[PDB]
């Protein structure tokens, strides 16, 4: 968590969709 907090959580919960569809 650099500078996307907000954003940051909801793409990387796209990411942790991916792993874990």
Not at 1 to 18: C, P, Q, R
Request: aromatic share 20%.
């Amino acid at each position: 968590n650099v500078e996307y907090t907000f954003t940051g959580i909801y793409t990387f919960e796209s990411l942790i969709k991916i792993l874990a569809r």
